[PDB]
Ligand binder design. Structure first.
Ligand SMILES: CCCCCCCCCCCCCCCCCC(=O)OC[C@H](COP(=O)([O-])OCC(O)COP(=O)([O-])OC[C@@H](COC(=O)CCCCCCCCCCCCCCCCC)OC(=O)CCCCCCCCCCCCCCCCC)OC(=O)CCCCCCCCCCCCCCCCC
Ligand SMILES: CCCCCCCCCCCCCCCCCC(=O)OC[C@H](COP(=O)([O-])OCC(O)COP(=O)([O-])OC[C@@H](COC(=O)CCCCCCCCCCCCCCCCC)OC(=O)CCCCCCCCCCCCCCCCC)OC(=O)CCCCCCCCCCCCCCCCC
Ligand SMILES: CCCCCCCCCCCCCCCCCC(=O)OC[C@H](COP(=O)([O-])OCC(O)COP(=O)([O-])OC[C@@H](COC(=O)CCCCCCCCCCCCCCCCC)OC(=O)CCCCCCCCCCCCCCCCC)OC(=O)CCCCCCCCCCCCCCCCC
Ligand SMILES: CCCCCCCCCCCCCCCCCC(=O)OC[C@H](COP(=O)([O-])OCC(O)COP(=O)([O-])OC[C@@H](COC(=O)CCCCCCCCCCCCCCCCC)OC(=O)CCCCCCCCCCCCCCCCC)OC(=O)CCCCCCCCCCCCCCCCC
Ligand SMILES: CCCCCCCCCCCCCCCCCC(=O)OC[C@H](COP(=O)([O-])OCC(O)COP(=O)([O-])OC[C@@H](COC(=O)CCCCCCCCCCCCCCCCC)OC(=O)CCCCCCCCCCCCCCCCC)OC(=O)CCCCCCCCCCCCCCCCC
Ligand SMILES: CCCCCCCCCCCCCCCCCC(=O)OC[C@H](COP(=O)([O-])OCC(O)COP(=O)([O-])OC[C@@H](COC(=O)CCCCCCCCCCCCCCCCC)OC(=O)CCCCCCCCCCCCCCCCC)OC(=O)CCCCCCCCCCCCCCCCC
Lengths: 176, 496, 54, 109, 79
């Protein structure tokens, strides 16, 4: 049987790379060719194209946030699961101000108005969600590894759920 | 023996600095993923089980089990027995039960049990419980009145992993706010579990009434109302800093090599600091007696208990009172015991055989470090309560004298119970841990047998006389609408 | 200088205590305790970061 | 939840957040959350009258590189290594997630 | 070989609160014992089907709540 031979090859290979250091954790020296490219192309490209374009986009983004009176981390959409899991655990004082800022922004945007300049002198790029995003990613990675390492077989279209993995009832068209 | 702690001598285990690379070689080998594999047909697929297939088995190596005692430099005591079984029973006992709670700290001991095996410094909640599950281990945490126990049952080859997981509960638990809040569910489940066991539920009513609003009367379980205000990670951490310390903790292992167990426990505390030991208020229990009538609208039967204070486990009356319990014995209609199963105890002969209306009559005896309760527990139909109490009181008045045959039968049955209970490993683990926490010493089953043989009728009379002078504790549970009043019981016993 | 919020306290760059950028610092040992492996390249990197089989 | 997916993978070209944070890695640590300052009662920066006088931002415009549409954000979905880089909390770097659990930064003396 | 214990391990303490190995009676047949051998009124064998958890069954009690609902609230179409 060829599947048995293939299974042994996979087992032996994976056993031979256990404990390997990830590529990013290796101390890597650039090749003599990438160093030349960085010496010539990268400086000129930054001065003439990348630097000005990205400053132009960044400064516009800061202005847009300041006009709405929101922070950058407010702009995250909770349809993303990491954001939703992080928002479950944020403390109440952070939550209250986040909601108020987001509500004011939508009112301003909907009515085509901008925040008064008196209230615009703040840094919008303060990363207040970072501790909770990292905790949420850790929780999700543990669940991924210890509980979702195989494609599981379940009885199909039973109890309001397709049986293909989703956990909410009536959350697909074929489960109406 | 290098150190004597509370009357017992222990061998001091020195901390050693070991590189993580070296220790990793000794960790038991196991996998969580099986990515591929080498196919191999079952070689015994055609061999019936009646045909032996194993040959050249190494000769067995049998050693008489002995209990060994050791202690770490941080003060954690280690007691293990190796019966050469294939399953280990690891147990961590901490001297922090409900009795040490202040009224503002009500239920914190139970809360600690509820947050057990949650996230620690070096492991997540999910990873801890999935590791316990994948390795086939079972266990949990139970908070008592004087101690809290963490226990795991496992194949002995995985002892290094199990000991690490248990210790992490008291070494560096992360009492994260959201994890703790998820444990509020367990309080309602704990109440349901307690109330389901009628015998245990009546026992808790006894202790609350016997010791009014003090050490041994503190509720074992936290309530689900105002107590949830301080069911917080911060509050639990403050409670643990008061009571949890290496000096108040004992690690017990059954069916584990002592040197290996000591080595791995040492490696767990080598580079970390345990909770420092601080003085705490330890007040003797105050016995008040009293009564409580607890209605259960669903139950048609009446459960009655009459109890008296005993000096406790550390007294010289421990064995004579225990013999008194076996002499009176008891039983119930539910069961039909064969020979040697209490059919000739005094309660069985004088109550069950002569009163068809009595559903069950037994003698209970709870022992703690410095106090205990002894009494009779009798059940029946609600309307029978006035007669059930009279039967119980009449038996209490017969404890003035005992026949020689009854004393000998009681002594022999007690010795049989001691030896037969000991052979259960989980029982032996819990017995050792509780004894050290209560007394700092372990009395072996054989030594208890020697004491039992020395009990005379004079000792039984003396102990019974002392019990009957205490103010009775009178609990009625179930259908209480016909039970006599408390003053009736006290006047009946006032003569004694 | 950067004594008060008006003077620039807490503004990266203007405030001496706060750097303009926060790049991670280099390390010589992995968190496991293994020595960090070293790889000196002599050819340009793969187009997609594709690793070669062992 | 409805059928959903996250890009929690091991990229071949992009490092994880533990290796290279994209946010300004300077945080203040307290012993209890109540020790943090209260923003409502904390004075903010002095208001300006010209849009050209507004303060500077801490974000790095060129945090990300390579082909693709420009974007500035602080977070990604990538998986972390079981032995993540030890954060420098002494300088203010944030320690949350794997860099706390699977490291010994939390250990004091 | 025969299996003498239920497939679901108890995981609880064998001894009751305040009762030790000395004063617990005989755990083999005592009524309050958690490890007493069941009585074979109808014969030996049914312990393979038996539920050893002392708590009575509460039909329909929820264990599939992931935190999406408060107690007493009825989900409607899963949401
Ligand atoms: C770069 C590095 C170096 C590279 C080196 C590469 C090395 C590989 C190459 C060498 C391979 C050697 C293979 C040796 C085979 C050994 C054979 C042997 O001894 O048998 C033992 C061997 C295994 O026995 P076993 O140990 O019991 O294990 C059972 C399992 O089969 C065991 O299998 P399993 O459990 O492992 O499962 C996998 C299974 C099954 O694997 C698969 O089938 C893979 C499926 C993957 C999805 C494929 C989707 C479709 C893709 C199409 C792509 C098309 C692209 C076109 C491009 C065009 C433009 C360029 O694989 C096999 O069955 C093995 C196949 C062996 C070769 C024979 C079949 C090859 C294909 C022939 C197709 C011919 C097409 C002609 C078209 C003509 C057009 C005009 O026997 C077989 O099972 C082999 C036969 C399998 C069926 C093949 C079809 C037979 C058709 C019979 C027709 C009869 C007609 C009667 C008419 C009567 C009229 C009256
Ligand atoms: C020159 C000649 C050349 C000739 C060349 C010839 C070549 C022949 C090619 C033959 C076809 C090859 C197709 C290969 C696709 C590979 C994709 C891949 O990498 O998948 C990994 C990917 C895994 O992704 P992941 O991100 O790792 O995890 C996924 C989950 O997020 C989380 O994953 P999890 O594992 O945690 O979740 C658990 C759950 C995850 O479950 C799922 O992922 C299922 C997803 C939902 C599937 C149902 C979708 C709704 C229905 C759509 C169709 C509507 C209309 C149908 C009727 C129309 C009538 C007019 O897993 C299981 O339940 C495991 C067992 C699954 C099998 C159950 C068997 C009973 C149900 C039957 C349906 C499924 C059969 C297997 C899939 C077939 C793929 C073609 O798995 C899938 O893609 C799942 C299957 C979904 C696609 C179903 C498509 C059905 C066919 C539709 C018509 C297509 C026409 C277009 C052309 C077709 C030819 C190409
Ligand atoms: C170089 C050459 C290149 C050639 C290019 C062409 C290549 C060939 C293949 C092209 C087609 C690919 C098909 C992909 C199948 C994907 C299957 C799948 O995964 O589905 C679930 C999947 C949902 O993913 P999921 O949420 O992860 O799944 C988990 C849930 O369990 C999922 O469950 P769920 O419920 O959430 O989602 C299910 C979803 C799945 O459905 C869809 O989304 C649509 C899928 C099918 C597409 C349509 C196929 C049409 C082609 C066949 C017909 C050709 C005819 C030709 C005839 C020629 C004659 C001359 O919705 C439905 O099932 C709706 C069903 C509605 C049925 C209503 C029927 C009427 C009522 C009942 C009967 C009548 C009443 C009774 C009367 C009685 C009388 C008495 O579907 C999608 O997301 C994909 C939808 C399709 C998007 C567009 C695909 C584009 C393909 C790329 C190539 C395009 C090239 C340009 C074409 C230009 C054309 C002009
Ligand atoms: C006169 C004045 C002239 C001034 C000259 C000035 C020269 C300055 C210095 C130049 C030094 C160049 C070499 C330095 C090393 C390379 C750079 C480097 O490594 O940077 C780091 C950079 C990224 O580093 P990393 O981020 O650390 O790596 C992470 C990832 O693993 C890798 O990063 P990744 O994952 O991002 O991927 C890397 C890259 C992958 O790399 C590349 O793509 C490299 C491309 C090189 C192309 C060169 C050949 C083409 C030009 C030929 C010119 C002929 C002139 C004829 C003149 C005749 C006169 C009579 O992929 C991308 O960036 C994605 C690109 C996506 C857009 C693609 C758009 C394609 C559109 C095509 C449309 C066509 C439609 C019509 C159909 C046409 C059919 C034909 O590394 C790479 O890009 C890796 C690949 C490097 C390949 C180098 C190939 C050099 C080829 C030399 C050929 C010489 C032939 C001589 C012939 C005989 C002479 C007599
Ligand atoms: C005689 C002729 C014969 C011809 C025979 C041809 C036979 C061909 C057989 C092909 C068989 C089918 C292959 C399908 C593979 C499907 C894989 C898949 O779906 O994976 C999803 C899978 C999902 O992964 P995930 O974990 O869910 O997500 C990964 C994360 O997003 C993040 O992952 P990460 O962070 O780890 O990054 C991994 C990295 C890994 O990336 C790679 O390794 C891929 C590198 C591809 C480089 C291609 C450069 C081509 C340059 C040509 C230069 C010509 C020079 C001529 C010089 C002339 C001198 C005279 O990926 C990326 O960096 C981003 C990938 C973006 C992919 C975009 C896909 C677009 C496809 C359509 C493009 C073309 C349509 C427009 C133009 C049409 C008209 C022209 O994606 C991956 O794992 C990455 C795979 C990406 C594969 C892209 C391959 C593109 C190949 C283009 C070929 C162009 C040929 C031009 C020839 C010109 C000659 C003159
Ligand atoms: C007879 C003897 C003869 C002997 C002859 C011998 C000849 C020997 C020849 C040998 C040649 C060897 C050469 C080797 C070169 C190696 C290169 C290399 O390794 O590159 C690696 C490099 C990857 O390394 P990396 O580190 O990722 O590189 C950095 C990235 O490039 C990007 O990363 P970054 O961080 O640097 O970039 C930041 C980001 C951000 O980039 C930017 O900021 C760019 C701007 C983005 C704009 C987006 C909108 C797009 C539309 C633009 C226009 C709208 C306005 C835009 C401005 C705003 C205005 C309000 O950049 C991008 O995303 C780049 C996108 C570029 C397109 C966007 C538009 C750029 C122009 C905009 C102009 C605007 C002007 C406004 C003026 C207004 C004044 C008032 O890969 C490439 O660059 C490869 C590209 C693909 C090449 C494919 C070649 C295929 C050729 C096939 C045919 C050949 C036929 C030959 C036949 C010959 C017969 C004889």
């Amino acid at each position: 049987s060829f599947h048995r031979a293939f299974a042994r090859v996979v087992c032996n290979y994976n056993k031979s790379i256990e404990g390997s250091v990830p590529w990013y954790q290796v101390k890597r020296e650039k090749s003599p060719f990438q160093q030349v490219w960085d010496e010539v192309f990268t400086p000129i490209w930054f001065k003439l194209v990348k630097g000005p374009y990205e400053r132009w986009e960044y400064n516009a983004l800061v202005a847009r946030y300041r006009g709405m009176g929101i922070m950058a981390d407010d702009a995250m959409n909770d349809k993303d699961m990491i954001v939703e899991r992080a928002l479950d655990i944020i403390p109440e004082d952070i939550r209250i101000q986040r909601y108020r800022r987001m509500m004011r922004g939508a009112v301003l945007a909907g009515r085509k108005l901008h925040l008064p300049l008196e209230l615009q002198n703040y840094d919008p790029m303060v990363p207040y969600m970072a501790p909770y995003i990292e905790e949420a990613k850790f929780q999700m990675q543990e669940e991924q590894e210890l509980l979702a390492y195989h494609p599981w077989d379940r009885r199909l279209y039973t109890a309001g759920v397709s049986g293909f993995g989703e956990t909410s009832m009536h959350s697909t068209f074929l489960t109406m | 023996g290098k150190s004597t702690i509370q009357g017992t001598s222990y061998n001091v285990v020195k901390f050693q600095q070991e590189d993580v690379s070296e220790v990793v070689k000794e960790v038991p080998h196991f996998q969580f993923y099986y990515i591929g594999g080498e196919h191999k047909d079952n070689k015994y697929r055609d061999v019936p089980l009646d045909i032996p297939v194993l040959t050249e088995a190494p000769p067995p190596q049998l050693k008489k089990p002995e209990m060994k005692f050791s202690v770490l430099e941080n003060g954690m005591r280690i007691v293990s027995v190796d019966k050469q079984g294939l399953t280990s029973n690891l147990g961590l006992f901490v001297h922090a039960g409900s009795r040490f709670e202040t009224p503002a700290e009500e239920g914190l001991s139970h809360m600690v049990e509820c947050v057990a095996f949650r996230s620690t410094a070096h492991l997540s909640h999910l990873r801890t419980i999935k590791t316990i599950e994948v390795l086939g281990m079972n266990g949990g945490c139970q908070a008592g009145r004087e101690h809290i126990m963490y226990n795991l049952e496992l194949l002995r080859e995985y002892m290094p992993v199990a000991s690490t997981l248990v210790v992490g509960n008291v070494l560096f638990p992360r009492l994260l706010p959201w994890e703790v809040n998820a444990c509020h569910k367990e309080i309602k489940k704990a109440h349901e579990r307690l109330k389901a066991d009628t015998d245990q539920y009546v026992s808790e009513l006894l202790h609350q009434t016997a010791y009014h609003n003090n050490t041994l009367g503190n509720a074992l379980l936290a309530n689900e109302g105002r107590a949830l205000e301080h069911f917080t990670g911060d509050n639990i951490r403050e409670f643990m800093m008061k009571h949890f310390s290496a000096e108040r903790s004992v690690f017990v292992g059954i069916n584990v090599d002592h040197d290996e167990l000591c080595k791995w426990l040492m490696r767990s505390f080598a580079e970390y600091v345990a909770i420092p030991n601080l003085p705490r208020d330890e007040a003797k229990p105050v016995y008040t007696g009293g009564y409580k009538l607890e209605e259960n609208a669903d139950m048609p039967v009446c459960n009655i208990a009459i109890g008296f204070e005993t000096e406790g486990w550390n007294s010289a009356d421990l064995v004579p009172v225990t013999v008194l319990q076996t002499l009176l014995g008891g039983g119930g209609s539910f069961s039909t015991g064969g020979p040697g199963k209490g059919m000739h105890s005094r309660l069985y002969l004088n109550v069950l055989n002569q009163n068809p209306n009595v559903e069950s009559c037994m003698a209970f005896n709870t022992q703690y470090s410095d106090s205990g309760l002894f009494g009779m527990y009798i059940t029946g139909f609600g309307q029978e309560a006035p007669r059930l109490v009279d039967i119980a009181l009449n038996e209490l008045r017969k404890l003035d004298s005992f026949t020689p045959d009854e004393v000998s039968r009681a002594k022999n049955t007690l010795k049989g119970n001691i030896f037969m209970n000991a052979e259960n490993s989980k029982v032996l683990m819990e017995d050792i841990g509780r004894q050290i926490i209560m007394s700092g010493k372990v009395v072996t089953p054989e030594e208890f047998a020697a004491r039992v043989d020395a009990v005379t009728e004079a000792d039984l009379k003396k102990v019974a006389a002392k019990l009957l002078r205490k103010n009775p504790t009178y609990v009625v549970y179930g259908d209480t609408k016909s039970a006599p009043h408390y003053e009736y019981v006290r006047t009946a016993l006032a003569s004694l | 200088k950067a004594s008060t919020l008006a003077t620039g306290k807490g503004i990266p760059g203007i405030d001496p205590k706060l750097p303009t950028h926060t790049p991670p610092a280099s390390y010589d040992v992995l968190s496991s305790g293994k020595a960090r492996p070293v790889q000196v390249a002599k050819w340009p990197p793969m187009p997609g970061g594709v690793p070669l089989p062992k | 939840h409805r059928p959903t997916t996250v890009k929690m993978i091991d990229s071949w070209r992009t490092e994880p957040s533990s290796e290279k944070p994209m946010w300004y890695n300077r945080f203040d640590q307290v012993d209890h959350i109540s020790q943090h300052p209260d923003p409502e009662k904390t004075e903010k920066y002095p208001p300006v009258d010209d849009t050209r006088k507004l303060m500077k931002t801490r974000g790095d415009p060129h945090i990300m590189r390579g082909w693709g549409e420009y974007v500035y954000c602080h977070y990604e979905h990538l998986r972390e290594p079981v032995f993540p880089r030890k954060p420098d909390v002494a300088k203010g770097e944030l320690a949350a997630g794997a860099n706390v659990t699977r490291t010994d930064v939390w250990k004091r003396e | 070989p025969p299996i003498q214990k239920p497939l679901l391990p108890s995981g609880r303490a064998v001894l009751k609160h305040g009762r030790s190995m000395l004063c617990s009676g005989n755990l083999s047949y005592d009524v309050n014992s958690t490890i007493k051998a069941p009585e074979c009124k109808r014969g030996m064998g049914f312990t393979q089907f038996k539920r050893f958890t002392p708590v009575p069954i509460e039909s329909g009690v929820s264990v599939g709540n992931r935190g999406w609902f408060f107690p007493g609230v009825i989900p409607y179409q899963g949401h």
